[PDB]
Symmetry: D2
Subunit: 385 residues, 4 copies
């Protein structure tokens, strides 16, 4: 085997971001297998043909189940909303196909448990799976993980993380699927809270032990998708059934305090994923709106010169950067997807289980469920270890 | 009446920062009364005499109660730890002396209630009082309040605030009174949590309704200045909802390695947002959500224009101010309130409401339950 | 015609950056013609075949002249060093091929004049040409141009620009082609000075009228490419024949003062292209290491709230951004190349002359020549209007 | 000897900023001599008496020459425009008075030469003098000098400096003495160009060798405080080489719309780089080029540690300082130099070398020729 046949399900949701990664990866990195964009799945035959020509896929299929039967599909990339992840990923693994699944892993803990079980059985048969928490593959974030691994942070006292967006801060913005509890599973919590739960656990190497949470919906009714705005009446609106924001306190198993905030109503903030970790030997700070920077404070340095150093994460020694451009020639949102592909293809070729695993996705799911339950119950909730 | 005699108690705690304000205020601002630095109080006779020479005070007294009798003390500035705030401030008010008292107002809600009760009765008799939440008088913070008052923020959805310091992040840093519950009341919570509770409430003009909190002590014993116990929190974190509906997220800690006095506030509303960091004290960032998306963004307002609060007393644009200036501004406002027959803000009633927030956070931590704040 | 056949010369220099643009442009933008990556040119047949498979080109040719004969080449992309631009671009235009040429336009004013003449004759016959000053197509930069065009800056008093890099700040870094006067034409001046001359003229819409300049070489000898470092002797080094840094004062035709600095010895600065323009109605500030931001001060705003606003250049109303990702989902160095392609393909389809033209490239060349002459002569030099 | 009597000339120009320094220095620093604010000079009797009350001066004099006779004036602080610096400072030195003189040292090189000559002779007789380039005493700038002295920057390749202000960017802003060549000597060049010339030379420890300059006046006539001519430059830009080989690029202007007091300096060397902006005064950024590329970068040093220059006199970490503090630091250093029998820096000789740089830039502009600076 020199090539790895790819089939993608969910082009309407993440097709552009995922497809560019499959196209670019072997051009910028020397991969042990060449990914072939073989099959794009979609029920609307004319729309999926159009998408296939735009995105670079050779054939299309109406029925996702067909991808699991085709010898030219070795790996299924599942990009749909959480409500369909368990059905599709479990089937794919049982059909002997490697799987890349978007986050969050599922819509319920029960689903995620079933996925983790299937992933374990599959791994025993050489069939690999990964949950695509893309921001782990931002070079600055991978660098932060390395600095912790190298011991430069020491005993972690504090984790603080915010994921601040504003894309529905306007109450007149209409209803859609990310606002429908049934497809999306949750709102801010599941969509963007998941990212920061996973990023903080990834960087520290520690896990959240207990949480105290509050979910809020600021705008509970919104114009229906084709409401009439005349010279919008009350009868033209429908209910919002997910959270607009989720906030929570945490303790980590190692003892650190954590403070988390994810919202779609942070007016002026667009994709501001903010993380700061404070430990006995140093601290790290990151903001995705400055994605190419990692700030690092060394607490062992002479107080005369100690301070957060601005590390421009564009050196060839930084994770992934060697595949791209010279120092100061910035990367962006899309590169992390390519880096995922590089790491997934490489794991498959080397017979290794990719990270984050479905088991890792399940633990994240358990944190999300605990925050939600904590909000409704008004009680702290422990996370199964 | 042209002069206002001042007596100060607690020089060893805040003596330098308060004295520079009393000295500077009439030189930089045209005040309706001239503050006279008349009496410095301290029980160590040699130490208080030295401090009086250094700090600009004309006479000294061993017994704080003597300030209550002296005709040349019109106003008592109380800078001791919270354990002594109630006894001193209430006596002073009852003796017909105006009072400035440091934060937090007291060590317990019951003490704060007695203080606010005395202040209310005293104010009806023309005797003024103020609690010194100094960061209100940072020009950028006063400007933030003004932008809210002008309607530029709209319906507030989020309040986030952090007060990040690292001064005891070293486990071998020694005990002091700030680590002693019997002196300070609490640790991070009362010392720096109080500041951000008050700052967010002041800027928004709204009040916290309920909280969920957790206090933590990372280092439980330290060297004496032999070793002893740390009996307060090193950090306090809490969720909040505000009466107007906003979600709040608060974090105050002495263990944020690399952060020195980072008071960070962001407020997000339907019409705009504000952001501030004290380590960039001279800046306020303001995003106008009603602006064309082509150019909408947080604008960096350098708070050094003569139209900005207090700045006209000082230096030209870009000629930065710092930590000490807010104390002078406190003095300007307090002296002017007294002269004009007005009650200064924050009032002891305001101080009491903050105390109730602090008590709720602490009680939430131990009980593991959400706690409502009385109105 | 629905397709536009591309041939690229100079893959070893800019092949990755240019090829990704030709591949991505029709996938992210709805182009009036589809660019086909038909021919990659290179004299080393085995190396160019390898490059063609990596970069996405269908065939290769040994002799660049062959591209000018092929009916499947409509447009020649010239990526080589300045020393070959005039020979290749003039020939291409005379063969009826559209041309994209890298900056600077040439190595001498005489060459650039010959290129501008050929471009004029070609344009009369419907054959288009552009000089690829890529940073004009950074969305923040295009936005800055729009704000000026909209009148928001007013009378310009000051232009300040720096291009700060450090890639040869180490004296032991060895000799190469960008250090050889004969291929490169100059060092910092021609390489990175050209970028800031053009960016400031583009944004303001004004031209430099006179300059006072100084060129410097800090490290005049460097280890030869295969020098022996034993237990590096003096005999193992060779001379550096270009400038390491170029600084100059300018006045603009409208009256503004300009202050320019380009260097390869700004230790710690990687690709920091810094521009600030101050005018009667407002000011603009930009730093490529924060490429996704434009800072804009409105001088007509109430002093109570006037200040530089941080514009995150990721709204769909900002130039080019609609083709990419949602707000806060950052772009990077590579996107400007794609935007060049979009604008070039669109100009060709619409029968318009692309900007910057070869004539615009010539005027830049005249500024560069004046700075160099000013340095040697120790006298101010006027730029032909 | 325990006290040092001060007399100040030029209150209407720098009276507030200099007086706060003389008042504050002994309260925050343990000084070997106590400065006594004894005499304020001014020809308008009522105005100078009011200012003396405001600013803390015990007596007043109409004639500046009277300060030269009075035994309670040991040190003359000269704050007038440059047109009067030479006459006053030389007379004071000759009368056996120590001198602090504002920048630039004078209006002409010839005047600066006479001042430096008098200062040299006076210093041999124990009479000290200093030119007040105040920004040297910003803690972050003093730290920058220390990092250079420690060898952390190595061989300097680049110096870039800007002093960006906008206070007369409005064409209708009125004339003042700062726009009058006969009072100020020059405009942006002498007022703010001088600061960045001295700052870069001080930090690097090197001197400018040659310059190519251009001065521009954007608004040539303005309203009086009827209209009159602006007889100075609004902006001064110049290239430089330093004696050690570095290239320098300098820009000073009053027309940088949106910039208020943005003094920006960056120094790039073989072993590291430094960057500073006064609008972020409490920060110094330091890049160590000898660091592993995995983590190399400019570190943000908050200049509020007790090991940083002067900071031990003030407030805890993160408790920011501002513009006024450098004046106090000047006083600390000047009083201590006098007490210890040392010559303070910058000296009048240092002031003269800066004057020669300014003269060269101006002469370069008019002649359109590069100009060398004498050593």
């Amino acid at each position: 085997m020199t090539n790895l046949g790819i089939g993608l399900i969910g082009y309407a949701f993440m097709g552009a971001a995922h497809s560019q990664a499959w196209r670019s990866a072997p051009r910028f990195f020397d991969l042990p297998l060449h990914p072939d964009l073989n099959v794009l799945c979609g029920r609307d035959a004319e729309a999926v043909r159009a998408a296939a020509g735009k995105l670079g896929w050779s054939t299309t299929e109406t029925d996702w189940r067909t991808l699991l039967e085709r010898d030219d599909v070795q790996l299924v990339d599942v990009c749909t909303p959480g409500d369909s992840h368990a059905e599709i990923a479990i089937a794919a693994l049982e059909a002997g196909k490697h799987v890349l699944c978007e986050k969050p892993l599922a819509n319920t803990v029960a689903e995620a448990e079933a996925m983790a079980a299937a992933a374990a059985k599959a791994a025993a048969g050489g069939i690999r799976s990964m949950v695509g928490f893309t921001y782990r593959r931002v070079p600055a974030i991978a660098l932060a993980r390395k600095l912790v691994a190298d011991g430069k942070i020491g005993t972690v006292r504090h984790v603080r993380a915010q994921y601040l967006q504003d894309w529905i801060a306007d109450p007149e913005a209409p209803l859609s699927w990310r606002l429908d509890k049934d497809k999306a599973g949750s709102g801010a919590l599941g969509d963007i809270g998941a990212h920061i739960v996973d990023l903080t656990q990834f960087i520290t190497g520690d896990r959240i032990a207990e949480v105290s949470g509050r979910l809020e919906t600021f705008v509970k009714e919104r114009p229906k998708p084709e409401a009439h705005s005349g010279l919008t009446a009350s009868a033209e609106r429908g209910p919002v059934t997910v959270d607009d924001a989720a906030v929570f306190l945490a303790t980590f198993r190692g003892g650190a305090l954590g403070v988390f905030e994810a919202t779609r109503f942070a007016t002026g903030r667009k994709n501001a994923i903010r993380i700061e970790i404070n430990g006995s030997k140093g601290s790290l700070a990151f903001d995705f709106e400055d994605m190419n920077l990692l700030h690092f404070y060394d607490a062992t340095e002479d107080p005369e010169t100690a301070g957060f150093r601005r590390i421009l994460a564009t050196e060839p020694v930084h994770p992934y950067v060697a595949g791209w451009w010279p120092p100061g020639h910035l990367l962006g949102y899309e590169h992390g997807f390519t880096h995922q592909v590089v790491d997934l293809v490489t794991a498959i070729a080397e017979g290794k289980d990719p990270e984050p695993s479905f088991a890792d996705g399940l633990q994240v799911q358990r944190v999300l469920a605990a925050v939600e339950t904590s909000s409704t119950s008004r009680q702290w909730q422990e996370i199964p270890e």
